[PDB]
């Protein structure tokens, strides 16, 4: 079980890597509703999530297991899929980052 | 056009600080040089802004339609933020000429169809109608950048 | 900081600057250089309250907040009439006309 | 250093600094006693103009926040006409 969380932190480490920076930068920090001028975001997204928020909970040992870690990762992507139309640029970057997550999360 | 933003797609965090007593209208110059308005800023308020490196920005008074200063100059360009340090854009009031400052007061108290009704020289009727705008200030800026 | 004043005696108004630390006497040196009248022939007033040469402009009530360039604070001035000092008389400025109909 | 006397139409004398008065192009066109007499500018308008001279010299090339120059609606037309005639 501790093997899982160690591998989970390693998966998130690569997600922060520069090789994925071209499309993973909008999800590094929490959604800045003030900076983006988003008024309806907090109304539509009942639970926001980003990559740094995962890092703090992972280092704070708040994830009971790996499945709980993946739920926040999936929650982070879906919020982008729920709020943004499918043709927008940010949805395309969220899919290309989720492909990085799904391919290693499957190979535990 | 010459004054335009570069399509760098490189993000950079910027803070818009309104140190002016009026509502500030931030204007962004796109990649074709055209001015595009952005949400306004109440006086004495600041907010984080997501922009990109090499983009043009100019700020306008929402009441007097006159231009405002940003970091003691007319134009603002976000640089690549270093060490994750935020870039500040202090929007302050300029030192208008007394004539232009007087025009700001007379325009705000008289409907444009009553300018000629006022008892002043006819040369001031034209100046009252010569309302400030981004287009006019952009033409003057480009001429200076064209010859230099 | 710096204060901005309006020294008024009758129909003469002087727009000068000084400091909260500068004394009332140093202000008389300024009036001495402009009007060719030594300090002992001058009395500085502040709306009917006489000012003493040993006090600073800040202690008199002139503040950086209340003596701004766009709205300077007025300083009364009276001159010695040979024998004695004249009464402080500050002639008021003209009055604006009635506001136009189409204004406001 | 040097001061200049600006006389209004109703006999009011306004002594300001030479550099400050030169903000007016009209006054600059007249000067190098050293005094300028305006027969069409009253005292309450010429006083407000001398305040603008101090306001301009102080906050030009300034790095602080610049305050708005106050203008009463009852003198907006008269102050505009003086500003247009003085080129300041
Ligand atoms: C309130 C206020 N008061 C006074 S001024 C002001 C203000 C208002 C708005 C903005 C606006 C705000 C920005 C997105 C507004 C749309 C509404 N949807 C949303 O924000 C939903 C939101 N999507 C994104 C996102 C990410 C990447 C994208 C597209 C979307 O792909 C573009 C990559 C290359 C583009 C280069 C360019 O030059 N791009 C240009 C143009 C050509 C217009 C597109 C550009 O963007 N420019 C020009 C000038 O530099 C200003 C700036 C701008 O327009 N910024 C993000 C996140 S989290 C996060 C950190 C980001 C970033 N995320 C998540 C997880 N889920 N969803 C979302 C800025 C200031
Ligand atoms: Cl905040
Ligand atoms: Cl990869
Ligand atoms: Cl683009
Ligand atoms: Cl740069
Ligand atoms: Cl006596």
Brief digest:
Chain B contains 3 helices and 7 strands. With 148 residues, chain B is α+β, with helices and mostly antiparallel strands. The radius of gyration of chain B is 17 Å and the shape is globular.
Describe what you observe in this structure:
Chain A contains seven helices and no strands. Chain A is mainly alpha-helical. The radius of gyration of chain A is 14 Å and the shape is globular. Chain B has 148 residues and is an alpha+beta fold. Chain B has two domains: 1-94, von Hippel-Lindau disease tumour suppressor,  beta domain (Immunoglobulin-like, Sandwich), CATH 2.60.40; 96-134, von Hippel-Lindau disease tumour suppressor, alpha domain (Elongin C, Chain C, domain 1, Orthogonal Bundle), CATH 1.10.750. In chain B, 22% of the residues lie in helices and 27% in strands. Chain B has a seven-stranded mixed sheet. The two termini of chain B are 15 Å apart. Chain C is of the alpha+beta class and 104 residues long. Chain C has one domain (2-85): Roll (Ubiquitin-like (UB roll)). Helices cover 15% and strands 33% of the residues of chain C. Classes of the chains: A mainly alpha (108), B alpha+beta (148), C alpha+beta (104), D alpha+beta (88). Chain C binds chain D through residues 4, 11-17, 34, 68-72, 91, 93-97, 99-100, 103-104, and chain D through 3, 8, 10-17, 20, 42-45, 47, 50-55, 58-59, 67, 69-70, 72-78. Strand 2 (12-19) of chain C pairs parallel with strand 2 (13-17) of chain D, so a sheet runs across the interface.
């Amino acid at each position: 079980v501790s093997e899982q969380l160690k591998c989970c932190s390693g998966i998130l480490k690569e997600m922060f890597a520069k090789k994925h920076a071209a499309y993973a930068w909008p999800f590094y920090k929490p959604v800045d509703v003030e900076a983006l001028g988003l008024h309806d975001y907090c109304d539509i997204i009942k639970h926001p999530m980003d990559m740094s928020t995962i890092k703090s909970k992972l280092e704070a040992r708040e994830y009971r297991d790996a499945q709980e870690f993946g739920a926040d990762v999936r929650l982070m992507f879906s919020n982008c899929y729920k709020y943004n139309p499918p043709d927008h640029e940010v949805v395309a970057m969220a899919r290309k980052l989720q492909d990085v997550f799904e391919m290693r999360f499957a190979k535990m | 056009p010459v004054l335009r933003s570069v399509n760098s797609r490189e993000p950079s965090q910027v803070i818009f600080c309104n140190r002016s007593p009026r509502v500030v209208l931030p204007v962004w110059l796109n990649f074709d040089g055209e001015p595009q308005p952005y949400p306004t800023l109440p006086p004495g308020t600041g907010r984080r802004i997501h922009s990109y490196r090499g983009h043009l920005w100019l700020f306008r008074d929402a009441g007097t339609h006159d231009g405002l200063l940003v970091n003691q100059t007319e134009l603002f360009v976000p640089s690549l933020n270093v060490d994750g340090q935020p870039i500040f854009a202090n929007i302050t009031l300029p030192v208008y000429t007394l004539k232009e400052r007087c025009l700001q007061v007379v325009r705000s108290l008289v409907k444009p169809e009553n300018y000629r009704r006022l008892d002043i020289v006819r040369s001031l009727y034209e100046d009252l109608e010569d309302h400030p705008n981004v287009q006019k200030d952009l033409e003057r800026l480009t001429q200076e950048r064209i010859a230099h | 900081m710096d204060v901005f004043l309006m020294i008024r005696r009758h129909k003469t108004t002087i727009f000068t600057d000084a400091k909260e630390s500068s004394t009332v006497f140093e202000l008389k040196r300024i009036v001495e250089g402009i009007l060719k009248r030594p300090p002992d022939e001058q009395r500085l007033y502040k709306d009917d309250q006489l000012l003493d040469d040993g006090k600073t402009l800040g202690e008199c009530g002139f503040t950086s907040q209340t003596a701004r360039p766009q709205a300077p604070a007025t300083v009364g001035l009276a001159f010695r009439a040979d024998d004695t000092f004249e009464a402080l008389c500050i002639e008021p400025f003209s009055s604006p006309p009635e506001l136009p109909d189409v204004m406001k | 250093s040097m001061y200049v006397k600006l006389i209004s139409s109703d006999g009011h004398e306004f002594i300001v600094k030479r550099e400050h008065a030169l903000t007016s192009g009209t006054i600059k066109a007249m000067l190098s006693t050293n005094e300028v007499n305006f027969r069409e500018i009253p005292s309450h308008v010429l006083s407000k103009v001398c305040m603008y001279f101090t306001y301009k010299v102080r906050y030009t090339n300034s790095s602080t926040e610049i305050p708005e120059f106050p203008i009463a609606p009852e003198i907006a037309l008269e102050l505009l006409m003086a500003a247009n005639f003085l080129d300041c």
